[PDB]
């Protein structure tokens, strides 16, 4: 059915370069310029630089060449038009490989032997062909898997600050996450080269790369490549999950960096900055990237997303967290207060929630006490924070029994439950057993959010 691949389409080599503007390379006398077309610019020095067209006009195309325009010469700069948009050579063997921002494998390995050439943009998923997520994808992180459990097909981002170990949490989730087939897809946008090396070495050493298709985009990598990277990861996820029937769990990283790349691309054109400099269509772009996931009807595969933002000034009112909360279906908050106390992962469960938790945490899924245990843990953790604030106001002695025991629960919860070894794999059952161990300090009469039957059976 792919016999149409056996076709040779010659490409036009344009030596007509009208001018150069910043990242742009404006051409002239173009025959039939196609919008969003990958272009191979050949420098006078001989170096070949890929490019994309941002604007099209009658016999004129404005190429936004990757890696900048340093060295572009009007007289001698060959420009070759690949008569198609950007496409990735997908394959079921893409698992186990590390790819750059443009899809080139940066691991010392062969080019991926394509099963097809899929467009990176993809197409919107038909809502009539979308299913509500049912089961949970188990994460080694006890905090997430117990209080903010993730269903098969939702989109729950991790809201972190600049210095918080969101990258380390992402690596842990990629290493430990599984079903309670599976093929994680990792997209790092604008990560420092040290962070990218950490990701690569961690996955190769711990064997998490066997099922991971890691897409690395360095901070020094081109901004258009940073734009392309999440589209590449979601196209790989769509391929695997829907044409292979496996669960994916895409883990995007530094969507703040992705939004910065969006800003750079928008201002490459004449677009006026929006609310906070970001383009007015950031809602649309983030919506596409996020809602690329989800379950479907005919296919027994799912895509889950962990966008992992980086809140710039530790605020939710910022456009990136606001829009991400609008499109996505939950929040996981990494807290500086928890991080400064050496608690890893520094996730606070009070602002963090998973709107689709009731579906994932059930009886056929997980264990039948999951939802009530999580609700009780949240209630008692809130009571613990209230009592911790109350102790320095009204003395330790004047606190009620439900406040002193709650302080003890808070200490044990933060220092043993939330505090998880970076390489400690806690299944959902082990995490729930630890949660019950924490709750058992309370007499059965005090645990009120738990149903009587579950309380009588598990306590």
């Amino acid at each position: 059915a792919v016999e149409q691949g056996f076709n040779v389409k010659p490409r036009l080599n344009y030596n007509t370069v009208s001018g150069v503007n910043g990242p742009l390379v404006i051409l002239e006398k173009v025959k039939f310029p196609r919008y969003n077309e990958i272009v191979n610019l050949t420098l006078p020095d001989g170096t070949v630089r890929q490019g994309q067209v941002l604007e099209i006009r009658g016999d004129r195309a404005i190429v936004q060449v990757f890696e900048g325009t340093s060295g572009i010469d009007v007289k001698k700069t060959t420009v070759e038009f690949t008569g198609e948009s950007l496409r990735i050579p997908v394959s079921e063997d893409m698992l186990g490989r590390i790819f750059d921002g443009s899809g080139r494998p940066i691991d010392n390995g062969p080019k991926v032997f394509a099963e097809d050439y899929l467009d990176i943009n993809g197409s919107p998923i038909n809502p009539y062909a979308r299913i509500y997520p049912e089961e949970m994808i188990s994460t080694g992180v006890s905090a997430i898997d117990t209080m903010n459990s993730i269903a098969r097909g939702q989109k729950i981002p991790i809201f972190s600050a600049s210095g918080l170990p969101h990258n380390e949490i992402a690596a842990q989730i990629c290493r430990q996450a599984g079903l309670v087939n599976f093929s994680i897809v990792f997209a790092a946008m604008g990560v420092n080269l040290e962070t990218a090396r950490f990701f690569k070495q961690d996955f190769e050493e711990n064997g998490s790369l066997e099922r991971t298709s890691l897409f690395l985009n360095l901070a020094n990598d081109p901004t258009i490549e940073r734009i392309i990277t999440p589209r590449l990861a979601l196209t790989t996820a769509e391929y695997l999950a829907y044409q292979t029937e496996r669960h994916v769990l895409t883990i995007l990283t530094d969507m703040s960096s992705y939004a910065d790349a969006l800003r750079e691309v928008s201002a490459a054109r004449e677009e006026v900055p929006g609310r906070r400099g970001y383009p007015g269509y950031m809602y649309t772009d983030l919506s596409t990237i996020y809602e690329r996931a989800g379950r479907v009807e005919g296919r027994n595969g799912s895509i889950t997303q962990i966008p992992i933002l980086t809140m710039p000034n530790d605020d939710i009112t910022h456009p990136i967290p606001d829009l991400t909360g609008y499109i996505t279906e939950g929040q996981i908050f990494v807290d500086r207060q928890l991080h400064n106390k050496g608690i890893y992962p520094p996730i606070n469960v009070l602002p963090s929630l998973s709107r689709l938790m009731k579906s994932a945490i059930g009886e056929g899924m997980t264990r039948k006490d999951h939802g009530d245990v999580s609700n009780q843990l949240y209630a008692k953790y809130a009571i613990g924070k209230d009592a911790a604030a109350m102790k320095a106001v009204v003395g330790e002695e004047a606190l009620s029994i439900e406040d002193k025991l709650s302080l003890e629960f808070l200490e044990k919860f933060e220092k043993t439950f939330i505090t998880q070894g970076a390489y400690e794999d806690r299944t959902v059952f082990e995490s729930l057993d630890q949660a019950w161990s924490l709750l058992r300090i309370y007499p059965k009469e005090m645990l009120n959010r738990i149903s009587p039957k579950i309380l009588d059976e598990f306590y």
Partner: protein, 590 residues
């Protein structure tokens, strides 16, 4: 050979500039002013002049040099002071014999009047030499004993001829490379485009720490050799003390102080003080000027030079790393570098993204901060250099809210944040514990386990103490602190003791000018042991007020632990700290 068409500030549009290339230096005008082509439209190439553009008239010839903004790398730049572009200020003053910088001054970046001792490397005639290989060594200073001559990267071939050992100047030939039958002459120096990073075979993960010297920076938020730091610009004494502390005791084999947008007399201070500083790394005291290359760019200098100073400094640091040295390039006022980029974008007409800053500000800052890191320098012999980027961001609004600060935090690994409250208390260094961080704790855990095994748990304990006492102090300021547990009272007392004795240190004081890593570990031992023993005693049942009255002497001892001299040596001082907490344990029995 185009002609000037339009002049409006630094931006000069030159017609007939066909065949030009982007970011290519072109000599604008009759004075031969340096300018980089930043925009091309047909045969007109928009140029940003790096000097004073006043007086340029339409029709002035513009000469294309054919090369990007290139820095002359080689022996002779290890001590000199440079402008934004590699303009030797000392050589300019000597040649011009005036206090001004003449327009279009063409003094060579590296002086050719000095004979350099040269000792040929292991390569001989007929051997194959690749880019970045070492084929010699030059005795520059006592500190830089061997300025190993590197074959320029992306240049390769077979050595047709190599020079013998002898005093050679930079203009004189050193080695010849044949390549594909076109013999190339290589001298003691070579030029490299500042925009293009210098290649390396592999960028290793930075492990060994960079000892800034300040106690809080060394303990709570450690930096490693080849890591970005993002120090606070000027308001806190973190930067002012930290620059000299690194230049004196950082163990960096070279330092490249880059000041972009630095104030006039604030640059004169550095140029007049850095010669005076000395180091004790060698057997005898030697000047820091033998180890430091300054890129001095005052705010008066053109905006294009202000933007280019950062690249010049980072590529000098890249050259010294490719030599195999550990370098700590200090960028002063990266905020002013970003402001220069914003001004250039406004000149060009680009659409600003965030608060006037260009949308590519994050990309430029990332391409700058990404040059840092330990790397195996290319070409034999195998050698492992490093470039640490200690960059400063100014407090634009008094807090970390500027777009430049946001991008720097997004792309950095260490960030030492300014505390306005601590600065207003004249508590130095004014490093905000809550907002600051260092992503090198995990990688530095290896060195800590190898040398000072209890360092990570101690710094985590101190961070926990500071956070708990910050929350408790918020509650105190809210509710009057009338009722507090004994444990909470110990927490606040210990946090105040830490913030007064451990975190606070006088950079100009003789004792606390440079607190070594072993001294910092011993002080953390003392403070954490004091807090833990006080907590244990309070849990036993002792009254905190009476215990404090009895142990004021021990508290004074652990406070004077800061006053403990570091020059006595690690052997003697640790023996004193061993006795300090030995009697501290017994004093709590009563």
């Amino acid at each position: 050979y185009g002609a000037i068409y339009s002049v409006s500030g630094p931006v000069v549009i030159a017609e007939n500039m066909i065949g030009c290339a982007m970011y290519e230096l072109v000599k604008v005008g009759h004075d031969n002013l340096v300018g980089e082509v930043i925009r091309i439209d047909g045969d007109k190439a928009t140029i940003q002049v790096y000097e004073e553009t006043a007086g340029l008239t339409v029709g002035d010839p513009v000469l294309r040099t054919g090369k990007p903004l290139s820095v002359e790398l080689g022996p002779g730049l290890m001590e000199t002071i440079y402008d934004g572009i590699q303009r030797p200020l000392k050589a300019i003053k000597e040649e011009s014999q005036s206090i001004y910088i003449p327009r279009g001054i063409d003094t060579p970046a590296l002086d050719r009047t000095i004979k350099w001792q040269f000792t040929p490397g292991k390569f001989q005639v007929g051997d194959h030499i690749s880019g970045g290989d070492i084929y010699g060594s030059v005795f520059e200073n006592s500190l830089i004993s061997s300025h190993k001559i590197l074959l320029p990267p992306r240049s390769r071939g077979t050595i047709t001829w190599i020079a013998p050992a002898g005093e050679y100047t930079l203009d004189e030939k050193i080695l010849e490379v044949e390549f594909d039958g076109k013999k190339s002459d290589f001298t003691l120096y070579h030029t490299w485009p500042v925009r293009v990073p210098r290649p390396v075979t592999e960028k290793l993960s930075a492990d060994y720490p960079l000892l800034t010297g300040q106690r809080v920076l060394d303990a709570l938020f450690p930096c490693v050799q080849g890591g970005t730091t993002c120090i606070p610009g000027a308001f806190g004494c973190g930067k002012t003390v930290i620059s000299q502390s690194l230049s004196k005791y950082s163990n960096s084999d070279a330092i490249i102080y880059v000041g972009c947008g630095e104030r006039g007399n604030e640059m004169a201070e550095v140029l007049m003080e850095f010669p005076e500083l000395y180091t004790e790394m060698s057997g005898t005291k030697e000047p820091i000027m033998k180890r430091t290359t300054l890129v001095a760019n005052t705010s008066n200098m053109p905006v294009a030079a202000r933007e280019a100073s950062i690249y010049t400094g980072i590529t000098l640091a890249e050259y010294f790393r490719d030599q195999g040295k550990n370098v700590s390039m200090i960028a002063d006022s990266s905020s002013r570098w970003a402001e220069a980029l914003r001004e250039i974008s406004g000149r060009l007409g680009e659409m600003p993204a965030d608060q006037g800053f260009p949308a590519y500000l994050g990309a430029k800052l990332a391409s700058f901060y990404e040059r840092a890191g330990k790397a195996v320098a290319l070409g034999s012999p195998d050698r492992t250099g490093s470039v640490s980027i200690v960059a400063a961001v100014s407090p634009a609004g008094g807090d970390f809210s500027d777009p430049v600060t946001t991008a720097t935090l997004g792309i950095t690994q260490v960030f030492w944040g300014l505390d306005k409250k601590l600065a207003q208390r004249k508590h130095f260094p004014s490093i905000n514990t809550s907002v600051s961080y260092s992503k090198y704790t995990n990688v530095l855990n290896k060195f800590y386990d190898s040398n000072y095994p209890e360092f990570p748990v101690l710094r985590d304990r101190m961070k926990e103490i500071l956070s708990n006492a910050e929350e408790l102090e918020q509650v105190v300021q809210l509710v009057g602190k009338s009722a507090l547990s004994d444990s909470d009272k110990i927490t606040l007392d210990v946090a105040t003791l830490i913030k007064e004795d451990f975190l606070q240190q006088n950079g100009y004081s003789t004792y606390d000018a440079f607190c070594p890593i072993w001294k910092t570990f011993d002080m953390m031992r003392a403070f954490i042991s004091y807090h833990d023993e006080a907590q244990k005693a309070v849990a036993n049942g002792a009254n905190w007020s009476k215990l404090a009255d009895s142990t004021g002497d021990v508290k004074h001892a652990v406070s004077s632990s800061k006053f403990f001299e570091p020059s006595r040596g690690e052997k003697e001082v640790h023996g004193e700290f061993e006795k300090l907490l030995s009697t501290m344990q017994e004093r709590f029995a009563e």
